[PDB]
Every structure is written in structure tokens, then in C-alpha cells.
């Protein structure tokens, strides 16, 4: 019923050894099949190491005065709006991280060239100062 | 290739600020392609390959767009 | 309800008190007649446990069709949380690039 | 195939090996969670009574394919539950008139 990667009633719940939560058969089987890891915790895990239990997990909270309109409408627009804001925020965050990473690589290579030229000039002036006395 | 931030205490933040970014701005002004960063962030991206379907596309379009005999006894009895 | 095979049809909704499901008299009759078993879970069952209707009356008490209300939450579940896991690993890689 | 304690399209229908009826996993989970018993026969039962069924349901709409309107299924099931409550009150009033 309550799960991190599901949040619904799963048909065949599957839990990871690092983090125990109800997971779908295709999500944990395909996700762990392509690359072995835990979907919710991003921890290393194996397909054969998945825990097998029948309807076993924790629960979650919820306010009172539960009705159909807040659930359907408020929960649909709230969950869809939160997932959309998380996907778009992750898109702009990954794009800005890619641009800032490109500028960081340019400053790393260029700063390495300036540090190499300045280090070679400092070593040349030091050797000239050492051999200049005789 | 060994420079410690605590090795030379006289120059750290002002030590390389203007001139360092001026030479780096000279190399970047010469050329600034992208290889390691774009290739590193290219495979994971953000959301690209999976993209899901259905409510992912409808929720994306909704993200880019911020926008009677029985009927009485039906809604009434339901109320 | 309305589905494709899987012993699903609004005719004689037989249910055996072993693995509870809505089945058909012919599907469970021939399938359970050849070898006693469930179509998926492979639970032990016989032909004597089969009944018709629900509590009474001929024909069948046809339930509503399948709107895939929990199935939409399962598909959007694994897809949403999957994009959140891939975006989480991409966020960790972005944090490493920032480091 | 209309369930007595559910009447909704069952995802994982369950029944206790006492009497022949179509129950639900949530009805026996919460009902048996409060007090252990069988809903149909009022017989004692344990946690092993409610099963996972077998094939659940093979729902084709499960990939809504850009529909993304859970309000149709949730509002339709809620309207069916309200109509079932109004029909239950009407059946109780007609039962009182018959008595």
C-alpha cells in the first residue's frame, strides 16, 4: 500500500537488501537487471539479493477529513505538479550543471596550462639565478 | 604539480583572482569546445532515454501550460 | 469484467475457496478437469467447489469494467519514481562534477 | 462477479475457506485487521484466509497513452460506491416496509 517507489498496491512487491520498500516487478527486475542497484536508495544491490515478502512494508501518515475531491483533484494536481516540478527542476539543474562543468573543465585545462607555463618560468628563473653567480 | 593552499599564505583568494581568470579567459577566448564535461553529463542527462509515457507527456504539456431527472438525485444522493 | 482470456468473463463467475478469483464454468471445468490447478498461482482446486452467480439467482452479477485505476498508479508509479531515481543518480553525478 | 463486500473490480480478490463468496484483499485486510472473522459466513479466520488470487487483472488501459485522467476512474468508482450506499439505504427502507 505505502511504498517509496510505488505508493500504491503492488502486484508483486520486491524489496532491496540495502533499503526495504515495496517495488514493482518490472521496475526492480528491469532496473536491477540493466544495472544492479537499489532504485530508491541508489545503493548497490543484486537481483538475487532482493527480499521476498508477502504484503510487508511500513505505512505513511495522512491528515483527517479524507474525501474524494481532495484525493482525486488535490492529490492528482499535487502529485503531478510535484513530479513535473521535480523533473523540470532536475532538467534545468542538470543542464546548468553541464554548463558549469564545461566552464570548470575550461578553467581546469587553461589553469593547468597557465600553471605549467608559470611553473616552467619560475624554474627557469630559479636555474638562471642559481647558475648566474659564477 | 604540488601547490598547497596553505603552502603560500600571502596569496590565496586575491592571489589568483583576476590574472588567473584572464589567462584562462585567453585560452577560453582562443577556443572553448566541450569534451569531458559534455561527455560525462551526456549519458545520464536529466530525463532523456526513459521519458516514460502517458502522464509523463501529458504532465509535461501541463507543466509548460500553467492552466435532468437523475442528476438531482445522483449528486444529491452522493452528497 | 472485460479482459482478454485469463479465465475472465461475466458468465458463471465460479470462485473456489482456495485461491479466490472470478472464473468461468467452462474454463475451470476443462482446465480443472484435465489437471487440478489455478491458471496462474497453480493452487489446488477441484470441480466440486465451482458455483454460479454470487449469492443467488440465475445469470451472473456482472461487476463494472476495468478502468485500470490501480494499474495507472502502478505504471505512473514505476515511471515517475524511475525518472526520480535516474534523475537522482544524475543529481549525484552533478554533485560530483560540482565537487 | 460482483463482490459482496467490495463490488469494485478486484485487484486481488480474497475469500476465507468457510463459505463461497467473492471478497477483497482490503476488505479482509482491514476487517480482519480490526477483528479476525469471515465477512460472508461470520466464521473465525486467520491471516492465511486472504489470498493473492492468481492472475490479478490484465488491464489494457494500464498504459493510459496520454489520457492521464485518474478522476474518471476514481470519480466513477466513488459514484458507484455512493450509488451502492443509496441503493443500500433504499433496500433497507424497502425491507422495513416489507417487514
Curated annotation (Swiss-Prot), chain B:
Please give the tissue specificity annotation from the record for this chain. Answer: Ubiquitously expressed.
Where it sits in the cell: the answer is: Nucleus; Nucleus, Nucleolus
Q: Which family does it belong to?
A: Belongs to the SPF27 family.
| Function comment | Required for pre-mRNA splicing as component of the activated spliceosome. Component of the PRP19-CDC5L complex that forms an integral part of the spliceosome and is required for activating pre-mRNA splicing. May have a scaffolding role in the spliceosome assembly as it contacts all other components of the core complex. The PRP19-CDC5L complex may also play a role in the response to DNA damage (DDR).
Assembly behavior: Component of the pre-catalytic and catalytic spliceosome complexes. Component of the postcatalytic spliceosome P complex. Component of the PRP19-CDC5L splicing complex composed of a core complex comprising a homotetramer of PRPF19, CDC5L, PLRG1 and BCAS2, and at least three less stably associated proteins CTNNBL1, CWC15 and HSPA8. Interacts directly in the complex with PRPF19, CDC5L and PLRG1.
- What name has this protein been given in UniProt? Pre-mRNA-splicing factor SPF27
Q: Per the UniProt entry, what species is this protein from, by scientific name? A: Homo sapiens (Human)
The gene coding this protein: BCAS2
Shown chain mapped onto the complete sequence: 13 to 113 of 225
Swiss-Prot record, chains C, D:
| Record's subunit section | Homotetramer. Component of activated, catalytic and post-catalytic spliceosomes. Component of the Prp19 complex/PRP19C/Nineteen complex/NTC and related complexes described as PRP19-CDC5L splicing complex and PSO4 complex. A homotetramer of PRPF19, CDC5L, PLRG1 and BCAS2 constitute the core of those complexes. The interaction with CDC5L, PLRG1 and BCAS2 is direct within this core complex. At least three less stably associated proteins CTNNBL1, CWC15 and HSPA8 are found in the Prp19 complex.
Per the database record, which ranges form the U-box domain? 1-71
Q: Where in the cell is it found?
A: Nucleus; Nucleus, Nucleoplasm; Cytoplasm, Cytoskeleton, Spindle; Cytoplasm
Give the species: Homo sapiens (Human)
The stated induction of this gene product is: By gamma irradiation and chemical mutagens but not by UV irradiation.
Which body tissues produce this protein? Ubiquitous. Weakly expressed in senescent cells of different tissue origins. Highly expressed in tumor cell lines.
Please explain the role this protein plays, according to its UniProt record. Ubiquitin-protein ligase which is a core component of several complexes mainly involved pre-mRNA splicing and DNA repair. Required for pre-mRNA splicing as component of the spliceosome. Core component of the PRP19C/Prp19 complex/NTC/Nineteen complex which is part of the spliceosome and participates in its assembly, its remodeling and is required for its activity. During assembly of the spliceosome, mediates 'Lys-63'-linked polyubiquitination of the U4 spliceosomal protein PRPF3.
Domains as described in the record: The 7 WD repeats are necessary and sufficient to support interaction with the RPA complex.
- What is the recorded name of this protein? Pre-mRNA-processing factor 19
Domain of life, per lineage: Eukaryota
The UniProt similarity line reads: Belongs to the WD repeat PRP19 family.
Amino acid at each position: 500500500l505505502i511504498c517509496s517507489i510505488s505508493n500504491e498496491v503492488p502486484e508483486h512487491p520486491c524489496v532491496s537488501p540495502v533499503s526495504n520498500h515495496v517495488y514493482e516487478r518490472r521496475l526492480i527486475e528491469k532496473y536491477i537487471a540493466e544495472n544492479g542497484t537499489d532504485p530508491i536508495n541508489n545503493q548497490p544491490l543484486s537481483e538475487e539479493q532482493l527480499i521476498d515478502i508477502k504484503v510487508a512494508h511500513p505505512i505513511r501518515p495522512k491528515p483527517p477529513s479524507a474525501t474524494s475531491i481532495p484525493a482525486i483533484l488535490k492529490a492528482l494536481q499535487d502529485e503531478w505538479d510535484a513530479v513535473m516540478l521535480h523533473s523540470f527542476t532536475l532538467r534545468q539543474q542538470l543542464q546548468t550543471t553541464r554548463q558549469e562543468l564545461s566552464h570548470a573543465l575550461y578553467q581546469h585545462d587553461a589553469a593547468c596550462r597557465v600553471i605549467a607555463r608559470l611553473t616552467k618560468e619560475v624554474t627557469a628563473a630559479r636555474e638562471a639565478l642559481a647558475t648566474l653567480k659564477p | 604539480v604540488d601547490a598547497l593552499p596553505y603552502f603560500d599564505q600571502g596569496y590565496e583568494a586575491p592571489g589568483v583572482r583576476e590574472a588567473a581568470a584572464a589567462l584562462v579567459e585567453e585560452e577560453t577566448r582562443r577556443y572553448r569546445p566541450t569534451k569531458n564535461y559534455l561527455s560525462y553529463l551526456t549519458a545520464p542527462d536529466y530525463s532523456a532515454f526513459e521519458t516514460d509515457i502517458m502522464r509523463n507527456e501529458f504532465e509535461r504539456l501541463a507543466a509548460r501550460q500553467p492552466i435532468a431527472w437523475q442528476e438531482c438525485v445522483n449528486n444529491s444522493m452522493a452528497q
